[PDB]
Curated annotation (Swiss-Prot), chain A:
Region described as Flexible linker: spans on this chain: 32-56
Outcome after substituting residue 77 to A: Very small decrease in RNAP activity
InterPro entries reported for this sequence: DNA-dir_RNA_pol-M_15_CS, Zn_ribbon_RPB9
Source species taxonomy: Archaea, Thermoproteota, Thermoprotei, Sulfolobales, Sulfolobaceae
DNA-binding is among the record's keywords: no
Name the UniProt record assigns to this protein: Transcription factor S4
Pfam families for this protein: Zn_ribbon_RPB9
Note: Strain 2-2-12 is a substrain of P2 that is highly susceptible to infection by Sulfolobus turreted icosahedral virus 1 (STIV-1).
Free-text note regarding domains: Has 2 zinc-ribbon domains (ZR-N and ZR-C); functionally important residues Lys-76, Lys-77 and Lys-78 are probably located at the tip of a domain that extends from ZR-C into the RNAP active site. The nature of these residues determines if the protein is involved in stalled transcript cleavage and thus activation (Asp and Glu residues in TFS1) or in RNAP inhibition (Lys or Arg residues in this protein TFS4). Increasing numbers of Lys residues lead to an increased ability to inhibit transcription.
Region (ZR-C): 55-92
Family statement drawn from the similarity comment of this UniProt entry: Belongs to the archaeal RpoM/eukaryotic RPA12/RPB9/RPC11 RNA polymerase family.
UniProtKB/Swiss-Prot annotation, chain B:
Record-stated family: Belongs to the RNA polymerase beta' chain family.
Gene: rpo1C
Biological process (GO), any one: DNA-templated transcription
Record flagged with keyword Ubl conjugation: no
Record has Lipid metabolism as a keyword: no
A cellular-component GO term for this protein: cytoplasm
Protein name: DNA-directed RNA polymerase subunit Rpo1C
UniProt keywords, alphabetically: Cytoplasm, DNA-binding, DNA-directed RNA polymerase, Nucleotidyltransferase, Transcription, Transferase
Function (record text): DNA-dependent RNA polymerase (RNAP) catalyzes the transcription of DNA into RNA using the four ribonucleoside triphosphates as substrates. Forms part of the jaw domain.
Length: 92, 89
């Protein structure tokens, strides 16, 4: 970002010149200014809720009570699960 | 194991009460009596079972004049004070 050596206002790029709108100053130096914003998609993928464990007993399963997709596989033979958000115990 | 004679007695004795109770209760009673195994069953047992079922149904009927709206409101609203908590509501 550059400022006029005389008026003190900022200089904007016009063609090959940077011109001060208030005083008409010009220069041979061009500096490009951009504003870059980043968007994060860490948790925006499509969820598939099959009661399969990822690490330990942590499985992905939809809770009938609150609707969270975090569960703990309490018992494999009974397909018994427990919600990690509201402690609800259910079967899927 | 219920022989055909006792089964016929059961079917005959169950057809004279079809108008005395609801149809679903009659079906449930018929389905339950046919599953009795391991016990030597008797006609007097069938008579007692059917009479007790009819009497038990008759004893459970609501009484005219009941303020059922207030009772329903109190039965629905009272557990509302006992509730202690996508994240649906
Ligand atoms: Zn200037
Ligand atoms: Zn839950």
């Amino acid at each position: 970002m550059r400022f006029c050596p005389k008026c003190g206002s900022f200089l904007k790029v016009k063609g090959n010149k940077m011109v001060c709108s208030k005083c008409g100053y010009s220069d041979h130096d061009v500096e490009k200014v951009i504003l870059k914003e980043n968007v994060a998609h860490e948790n925006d993928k499509t969820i598939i809720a099959d009661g399969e464990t990822i690490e330990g007993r942590v499985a992905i399963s939809l809770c009938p009570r609150c609707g969270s997709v975090r569960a703990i596989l309490l018992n494999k033979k009974k397909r018994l699960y427990r919600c990690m958000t509201c402690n609800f115990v259910y079967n899927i | 194991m219920i022989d055909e004679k006792l089964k016929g007695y059961i079917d005959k004795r169950l057809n004279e009460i079809k108008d005395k109770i609801p149809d679903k209760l009659h079906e449930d009673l018929r389905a339950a009596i046919m599953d009795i195994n391991g016990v030597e069953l008797t006609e007097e047992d069938i008579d007692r079972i059917i009479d007790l079922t009819i009497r038990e149904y008759q004893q459970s009927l609501i009484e005219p004049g009941e303020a059922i709206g207030v009772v329903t409101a109190q039965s629905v609203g009272e557990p509302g004070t006992q509730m202690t908590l996508l994240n649906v509501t």
